[PDB]
Amino acid sequence: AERADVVIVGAGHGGAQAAIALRQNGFEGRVLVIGREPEIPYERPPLSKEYLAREKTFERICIRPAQFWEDKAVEMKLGAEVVSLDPAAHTVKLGDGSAIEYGKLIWATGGDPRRLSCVGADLAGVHAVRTKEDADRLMAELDAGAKNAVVIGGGYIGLEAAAVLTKFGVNVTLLEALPRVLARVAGEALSEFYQAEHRAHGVDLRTGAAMDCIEGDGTKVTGVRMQDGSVIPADIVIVGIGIVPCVGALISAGASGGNGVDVDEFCRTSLTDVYAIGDCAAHANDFADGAVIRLESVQNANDMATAAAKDICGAPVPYKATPWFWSNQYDLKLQTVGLSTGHDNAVLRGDPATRSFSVVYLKGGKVVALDCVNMVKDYVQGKKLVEARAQIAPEQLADAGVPLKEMLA
Numbered sequence: 001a002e003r004a005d006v007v008i009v010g011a012g013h014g015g016a017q018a019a020i021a022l023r024q025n026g027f028e029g030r031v032l033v034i035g036r037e038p039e040i041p042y043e044r045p046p047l048s049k050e051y052l053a054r055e056k057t058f059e060r061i062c063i064r065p066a067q068f069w070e071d072k073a074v075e076m077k078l079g080a081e082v083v084s085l086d087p088a089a090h091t092v093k094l095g096d097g098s099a100i101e102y103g104k105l106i107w108a109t110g111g112d113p114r115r116l117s118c119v120g121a122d123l124a125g126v127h128a129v130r131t132k133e134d135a136d137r138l139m140a141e142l143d144a145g146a147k148n149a150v151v152i153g154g155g156y157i158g159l160e161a162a163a164v165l166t167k168f169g170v171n172v173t174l175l176e177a178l179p180r181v182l183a184r185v186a187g188e189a190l191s192e193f194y195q196a197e198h199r200a201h202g203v204d205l206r207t208g209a210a211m212d213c214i215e216g217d218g219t220k221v222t223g224v225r226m227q228d229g230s231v232i233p234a235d236i237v238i239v240g241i242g243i244v245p246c247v248g249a250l251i252s253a254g255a256s257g258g259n260g261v262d263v264d265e266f267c268r269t270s271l272t273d274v275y276a277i278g279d280c281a282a283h284a285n286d287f288a289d290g291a292v293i294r295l296e297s298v299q300n301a302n303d304m305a306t307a308a309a310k311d312i313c314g315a316p317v318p319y320k321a322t323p324w325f326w327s328n329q330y331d332l333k334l335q336t337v338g339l340s341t342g343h344d345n346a347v348l349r350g351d352p353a354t355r356s357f358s359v360v361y362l363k364g365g366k367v368v369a370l371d372c373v374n375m376v377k378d379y380v381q382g383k384k385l386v387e388a389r390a391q392i393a394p395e396q397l398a399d400a401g402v403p404l405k406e407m408l409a
């Protein structure tokens with residue numbers, strides 16, 4: 001029976017970083033990663049940014065070069081997926097029926113997009129832009145002359161995808177069910193800014209737009225059936241709504257968790273010797289006042305990968321890192337630190353008209369988050385304020401003429 005000391009399932013950010021972290025902390029056993037995609041670990045943020053826009057090759061988005069994995073003795077079974085697991089037998093079953101045995105297991109499977117077809121079948125070219133493969137198809141379809149795109153969801157991915165699509169000179173309609181874009185991740189100051197910016201770039205942006213399902217001709221997408229129930233014609237649909245954690249096999253095996261899979265501060269699930277990291281793993285977060293949340297970011301994947309590995313190496317260090325995020329749309333470079341969710345005050349810092357400003361978020365008089373559009377100084381210094389839970393007057397924060405670092409006691 002094929003067996004590894006550590007088996008990593010998923011070869012994305014979590015998986016790759018998990019393997020890197022293992023070796024960097026001196027792990028010497030066999031390390032095997034099983035990833036359902038055919039290519040070596042590559043970065044996902046480019047899929048709605050520089051890669052989709054053909055400013056980077058595939059080589060320049062790879063997490064590590066091919067030779068690195070050879071050097072670090074990281075074995076990889078690509079184009080293979082774990083279909084189930086037996087936590088008792090410490091065993092994993094693959095899509096071809098074969099079984100691999102593990103000492104420790106790291107579940108880094110991320111999530112998958114919602115299926116939104118009117119008649120339930122897969123449609124070209126409906127894209128979540130979550131794989132290199134999918135991005136490549138969208139790119140090919142654009143070359144071949146597809147010109148009417150409908151983006152579903154006003155989250156970061158949706159906006160980014162919309163933005164790069166306008167660079168291709170095609171028609172872009174964005175649909176947001178909520179009263180504003182970014183409603184789940186930022187305040188109204190940011191929303192207004194991005195809505196205004198996108199519209200100025202030719203995007204037909206529609207809020208309170210509730211969608212039913214995606215129409216096709218049996219082979220390809222032709223429109224988006226709304227709930228009202230008009231149809232918007234489309235030859236391209238971008239699905240940018242909440243993903244579903246690829247967690248099924250864990251739940252089936254008895255792992256606890258309502259939203260993905262639950263893990264402690266060492267990224268351990270309720271099943272012995274199995275960890276979960278990245279998009280699929282829910283965790284109690286200090287910057288969310290103890291609530292068990294499921295962050296979907298590179299920072300989070302990186303940091304959970306580290307904690308799982310350190311624990312596996314026998315030198316555990318809790319996952320206590322400060323959450324951060326970024327979004328690149330047009331010439332707008334957003335950098336976010338902390339979690340704004342549940343803020344009671346959002347202080348505008350600078351002038352949105354200059355397209356370089358910050359929003360400082362507070363809760364109960366304490367700084368909890370920053371959104372920084374082309375404002376790296378505020379982002380860098382703001383981290384300290386977020387970590388300090390700094391109690392600074394809004395009247396002080398709002399003065400862009402004073403550096404944030406000067407404000408803390």
Ligand SMILES: Cc1cc2nc3c(=O)[nH]c(=O)nc-3n(C[C@H](O)[C@H](O)[C@H](O)COP(=O)(O)OP(=O)(O)OC[C@H]3O[C@@H](n4cnc5c(N)ncnc54)[C@H](O)[C@@H]3O)c2cc1C
Pocket residue numbers: 009010011012013014015034035036037044045046047048080081082083108109110111128129130157246277278279280295296297298299301324325326327328
């Ligand atoms: C278009 C796009 C843009 C993004 N931009 C940003 C950004 O700008 N900044 C930021 O912080 N975050 C961004 N993100 C989010 C970030 O990429 C994710 O948080 C990160 O990928 C999570 O790491 P992960 O390992 O948990 O999931 P992933 O990196 O997605 O890796 C999961 C891998 O596991 C594989 N898998 C699934 N099921 C199985 C199975 N059963 N067996 C084996 N393998 C399996 C999948 O094929 C996938 O390759 C973006 C995401 C997308 C989709």
